[PDB]
């Protein structure tokens, strides 16, 4: 099953507008292999990632994850971003973190301009338990059992400068790939769309 | 304790005149703040000895023109010449070629160790002045960003304190 997992498949979508403030949170991401939100109206279908279907048939999972944030700007856009890794669980008040407090956590800077789009950001296993359970089979929250080993925040590290004859937004795609992945104790569970 | 820390975010505009100082800050004092991981090592240890790594990234649109200056100044800009700043280890900016420079300077200070609670004078003072005016026509955007990524190099720690 390695053939479907490490191939980068689209999981989310967020643009980079120019009408935002310096350090404003754009999108928060629960980092897990269970992540998908896109769909389609015609035909009636909800788009799935190739990583999530492999991992939705297990009780536990363990392994690293690689996000691929591909931008499609013009050659004249600029500004930067900050890809901070905030660990823990899926349920804190994560949207109160100051931008300089995110500098203590591990991160990666990136320039928007240039001739290389995809930055292959890899997720380490920051965890308290060695085996991380599929909690989405249950319907009641419980401390001790988690599904996300961290949360990704794409900050507005700088604003968007642009010419007049283009638009005021740069779309960033979210692929999903994984490495050193391990799963056991099979089940069956049809996952639900995470609307964050 | 050695990782790039954004310390200031300003925006270089078109309405600035020639030789206008865009940024005026202390590199050492802005790294002394609660929102960084270098607070965790410097809070128990009073004395400090460090080199200064500087990387500054700007983002102009290619339908503008102009240039900047980024010099590293020990102490203050008391009576130094604006036109003779290239004797300092500097890095220039251009709307034609590049947008990333780096400057590595050593610890220039009257003493050897540093006291955080009562400094005599600031050790380094990063200066950014308008080297050429930013001109636009009609439709070209009238703003371009500016960011300063700074970090320590070769840190020593001596003489632990009980107070914060």
């Amino acid at each position: 099953f390695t053939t479907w997992t490490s191939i980068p498949t689209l999981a989310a979508q967020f643009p980079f507008n120019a009408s935002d403030s310096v350090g404003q949170q754009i999108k928060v991401i629960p980092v897990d292999p269970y992540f998908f939100q896109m769909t389609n109206t015609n035909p009636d279908q909800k788009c799935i990632t190739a990583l999530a279907s492999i991992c939705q048939m297990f009780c536990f999972w363990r392994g690293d994850l690689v996000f691929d944030f591909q931008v499609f700007p013009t050659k004249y856009h600029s500004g930067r971003l900050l890809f901070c890794f905030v660990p823990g669980n899926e349920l804190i008040d994560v949207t109160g973190i100051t931008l300089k407090q995110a500098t203590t956590a591990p991160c990666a800077v990136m320039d928007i301009a240039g001739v290389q789009s995809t930055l292959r950001f890899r997720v380490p296993w920051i965890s308290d338990t060695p085996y991380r359970v599929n909690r989405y089979t249950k319907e009641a929250h419980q401390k001790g059992e988690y599904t996300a080993i961290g949360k990704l925040i794409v900050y507005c590290y700088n604003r968007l400068t642009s010419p007049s004859n283009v638009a005021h937004h740069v779309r960033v795609n979210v692929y999903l790939s994984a490495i050193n992945l391990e799963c056991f104790a099979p089940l069956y569970h049809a996952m639900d769309v995470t609307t964050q | 304790g050695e990782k790039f820390f954004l310390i200031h975010s300003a925006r270089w505009l078109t309405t600035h005149a020639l030789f206008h100082e865009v940024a005026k800050l202390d590199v050492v004092k802005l790294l002394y703040n609660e929102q960084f991981a270098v607070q965790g090592l410097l809070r128990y240890h009073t004395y400090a000895r460090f080199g200064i790594e500087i990387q500054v990234q700007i983002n102009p649109t290619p339908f503008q023109q102009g240039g900047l200056i980024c010099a590293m100044v020990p102490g203050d800009q008391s009576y130094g010449s604006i036109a003779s700043l290239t004797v300092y280890p500097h890095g220039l900016l251009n709307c034609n070629i590049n947008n990333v420079v780096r400057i590595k300077v050593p610890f220039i200070y009257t003493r050897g160790a540093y006291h955080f609670k009562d400094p005599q004078y600031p050790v380094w003072e990063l200066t950014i002045r308008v080297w050429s005016e930013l001109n636009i026509g009609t439709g070209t955007s009238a703003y371009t960003s500016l960011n300063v990524l700074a970090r320590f190099t070769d840190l020593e720690l001596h003489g632990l304190t009980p107070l914060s």
Partner: antibody
């Protein structure tokens, strides 16, 4: 376009109660923490309530501490301000407010139209 | 808990001249925001920390200052600036705003 449209307000006798609300559109409010900003008719605004993305961290000032109660629902994408023990000092205009995050402090981006609560009988 | 006042209360200024108000803190403040209450509507994205305008705000304005006293210096007076501003700190528990400067048009 963002429309943080309030709803509620009216005429409550002093000693009564009221539950405010603010509808939301063009974005998910599940990230940004929201706020109620009260406009006195003497042009003196006051920051009285703010709860974060989850329903855990509440930041109450000295004045409304023990009087009012803020609540949210991330699925319905609306707001709630359960008020009680009303008096003439809170006879003022209300505004739902979105709080966003800057580099060292926080900041308000988008505000609403406003609901009138006159606490007098 | 500390009080933010504003030294201009009611100001009337001619089109095309220099206008400057002041939000004078009674303490050392880092970054003092500003707002714009237009007559009939609510304040919006107007000014953040000290010199960072919004995206829809006109680029003819200026803001500066260090330490206590900050100034929002207007370089070009126009007709759409007949509104009331505020000023805010973000460092205590009880966030109190400014007094309000009603800047109108001197005809």
């Amino acid at each position: 376009e963002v429309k943080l449209v309030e709803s509620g307000g009216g005429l409550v006798k002093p000693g009564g109660s009221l539950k405010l609300s603010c509808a939301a559109s063009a974005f998910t409010i599940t990230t940004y923490g929201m706020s109620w900003v009260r406009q006195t008719p003497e042009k003196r605004l006051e920051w009285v309530a703010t709860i974060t993305a989850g329903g855990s961290y509440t930041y109450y000032p000295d004045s409304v501490k023990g009087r009012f109660t803020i609540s949210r629902d991330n699925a319905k994408n609306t707001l709630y301000l359960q008020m009680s023990s009303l008096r003439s000092g809170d006879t003022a205009m209300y505004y739902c407010a979105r709080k966003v995050t800057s580099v060292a402090e926080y900041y308000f981006d988008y505000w609403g139209q406003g609901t009138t609560l006159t606490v007098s009988s | 808990d500390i009080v933010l006042t504003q030294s201009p209360a009611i100001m009337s200024a001619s089109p095309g001249e220099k206008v400057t108000m002041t939000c004078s803190a009674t303490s050392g403040l880092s970054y003092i925001h500003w707002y714009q209450q237009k007559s009939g509507t609510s304040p919006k994205r107007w000014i953040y920390d000290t010199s960072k305008l919004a995206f829809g705000a006109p680029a003819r304005f200026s803001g500066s200052g260090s330490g206590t006293s900050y100034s929002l210096t207007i370089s070009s007076m126009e007709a759409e600036d007949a509104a009331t501003y505020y000023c805010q700190q973000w460092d205590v528990n009880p966030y109190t705003f400014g007094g309000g400067t009603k800047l109108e048009i001197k005809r």
